[PDB]
Amino acid sequence: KLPPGWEKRMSRXSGRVYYFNHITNASQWERPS
């Protein structure tokens, strides 16, 4: 599973997947380990 707080999203816009963290407000293109 994704680590705590992380959600996989897609901007169906560009079709790019990204990840967002609810705890920290961080976002990143790559899947968290």
Q: Is CATH 1.10.287.3510 what the domain over 1-33 is classified as, yes or no?
A: no
| Coil, helix or strand at residue 28 | strand
24: left (phi > 0), else alpha (psi -120 to 50), else beta? Answer: alpha
**What gap in Å lies between CA 12 and CA 1, rounded to an integer?**
22
For residue 13, give both structure tokens. Answer: 């816009």
Domain boundaries, given as residue ranges, for the chain = 1-33
SS (H, E, C) the chain: CCCCCEEEEEECCCCEEEEEECCCCCEECCCCC
Resolution given for this structure, in angstroms:
1.5
- Taking phi first (over 0 means left), then psi (-120 to 50 degrees means alpha), and beta for anything else, what does residue 16 get? beta
Structure tokens at 14: 């560009």
Solving technique: X-ray
Q: Which two tokens stand for residue 7?
A: 């959600």
Q: Encoding tokens for residue 32?
A: 């968290």
